[PDB]
Ligand binder design. Structure first.
Ligand SMILES: [Cl-]
Ligand SMILES: [Cl-]
Lengths: 263, 256
């Protein structure tokens, strides 16, 4: 190699949005995008129904596909409605998103995924050879009462208890999404993102190792747009983005373009 | 005359090649499917492949779950009933005991959550395989009717209109029969199915009671399906492990 630097990363989380035609449109946008993706790992996470269609028509090796969740149940068996990491890997899907705040909160009255459940999913995924976009983030109340570092440490420490081997962390990307920035239009400042991402990297260094700290991409999400991404990416510890609503439009290609440093 | 119904729940089993094999088995099956509704439920990753290659009109596809969140939006890792319907998937399985129990320390789906899923699915034009069933402890302590009534009544509170029940098939799966080899006796299944049908008649309407398929699951095999189907209130089967092999075709043939 010539250089040792963390490669930029942009994930697109489509959430619960998608049809056969809209999937085709997004894939066509990614295939024709007149921006080079050479310097950036790009990952897109369609709803599970549409992943095979994306795998069949995507013609950019530099874009990889992800599932939006992966089961606590690691292998094949009697787990109705669950996609296990072994299934996902054997279907040639290289990435999964785990611990998104929407899944930590839960749906329709069903309790969500605790720190411990997320950690169990992460361990199972890594055991089966997947790479993981691990989501963490504090609430508005936690932020305003000065608890962000304590909270993010608790979320990450649960993952470390389940994945105590440092080598496994090679295939983790951490997505810092403050809950208060999700869907609200309240994008973190460039200064707040950089500060918190550096706290996350200092956590990796103390709890896992300095090597894991230097290699792990820490990406920002929460109201990311083409028009705010370049300023966000000036932070030395901001390695890219996890993109929600903007992943469904042409704005996604502008965000990818922002996750490059040029001389 | 209630039309026979056989569902095949593949559960968390599937690869691209095994999906192809199962679809080839269904396409070449040397039974007529004329007298029986057949539905198969692949993992969500493989549904579109099954939709592309299945060449048996009489077989339809299903998802194994459907979200409490009805439409499109910010629901990471959820498949909404609206999405499922717009992808031309006509059926969903809801309230399977595996999902009521939950996975890996995450709490499972309450009676109320299952009911919310049912209502959302029916609102979007889906048909629903609604799963109910008691535990071994509940069975042995005389609580089967109480438990099944609670599970069904939660759904009725969310779906009080009797017309909406046209698109429900009830799957009775005693938890103690799932994955254990302990198939219910033909007598126990028929008795409980009749209790379930009397519940429909009193709580919903006599018409709903007469039309609703009530299907049995829990260690169903080709070798036990014919005897099970002699029950007047046993309208077919929800098949787990045997849905992954040629034995599934023998089960379909038993529900004629
Ligand atoms: Cl996101
Ligand atoms: Cl089943």
């Amino acid at each position: 190699a010539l250089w040792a630097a963390r490669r930029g990363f942009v994930g697109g989380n489509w959430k619960c949005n998608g049809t056969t035609a809209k999937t085709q449109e997004l894939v066509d946008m990614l295939n024709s995008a007149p921006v080079s993706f050479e310097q950036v790992d790009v990952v897109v996470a369609p709803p599970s129904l549409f992943i095979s269609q994306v795998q069949d028509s995507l013609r950019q090796p530099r874009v990889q596909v992800a599932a939006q969740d992966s089961s606590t149940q690691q292998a094949y068996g009697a787990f109705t409605g669950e996609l296990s990491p072994k299934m996902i890997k054997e279907k040639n899907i290289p990435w999964v998103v785990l611990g998104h705040s929407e899944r930590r909160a839960g749906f329709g009255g069903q309790p969500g995924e605790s720190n411990q459940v997320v950690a169990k999913k992460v361990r199972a995924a890594l055991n089966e050879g997947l790479s993981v976009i691990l989501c963490i983030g504090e609430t508005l109340e936690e932020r305003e009462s000065g608890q962000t570092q304590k909270v993010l440490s608790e979320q990450l420490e649960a993952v470390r208890q389940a994945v105590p081997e440092a080598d496994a962390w090679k295939s983790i990307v951490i997505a810092y999404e403050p809950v208060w920035a999700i869907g609200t239009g309240k994008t973190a400042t460039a200064a707040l993102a950089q500060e918190t991402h550096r706290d996350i990297r200092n956590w990796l260094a103390q709890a896992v190792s300095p090597k894991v700290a230097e290699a792990t991409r820490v990406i920002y999400g929460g109201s990311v747009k083409g028009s705010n991404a370049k300023e966000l990416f000036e932070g030395e510890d901001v390695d890219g983005f996890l993109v929600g609503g903007a992943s469904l439009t042409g704005d996604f290609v502008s965000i990818i373009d922002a996750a490059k440093q040029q001389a």
